[PDB]
């Protein structure tokens, strides 16, 4: 059990809320939403361009019933305060011509459609920093073999989508209480 650790050195609490901040200060702020393409409301998960913004508090929930979160545990990530038009706070990944993208949903989704993320510790770093993996179905199981990154749309939105090249690296900062 090599548990997830937060930006202040404490074990990440399962079901707890955290800001998802970039490792490098210059690279923008925390996670929030945008309304893109033909969506009727903000259903796109993006990174804030404000380096001072902590973004939205995000709930991290494991596939296990543990107080903390083991390493290779699958997780679901959800907004503590989701846009009024999403049916639930949880993120999901949607296929597209450009490739899979991270979005919210106007309907309740099955657990196997939200429990599709995993954090991967980064080497060479003093603070606890992780990459974010996407785990596609394996006709029966699931395989975490693609990473999540940023694709800036023609409007400047910093969209979270599956990436091939430069994955994002995050620190998890515990949310207010």
Curated annotation (Swiss-Prot):
It comes from the Eukaryota. PROSITE patterns: SOYBEAN_KUNITZ (PS00283). One of its GO terms (molecular function) is serine-type endopeptidase inhibitor activity. Keywords: Disulfide bond, Protease inhibitor, Serine protease inhibitor, Signal. The keyword Ion transport does not apply. The record marks 65-66 as: Reactive bond for chymotrypsin. It holds the Pfam family Kunitz_legume. Disulfide bonds join 41-85, 135-144. The keyword Signal applies. Inhibits alpha-chymotrypsin at the molar ratio of 1:2 in state of 1:1. Belongs to the protease inhibitor I3 (leguminous Kunitz-type inhibitor) family. This is Chymotrypsin inhibitor 3. It comes from Psophocarpus tetragonolobus (Winged bean).
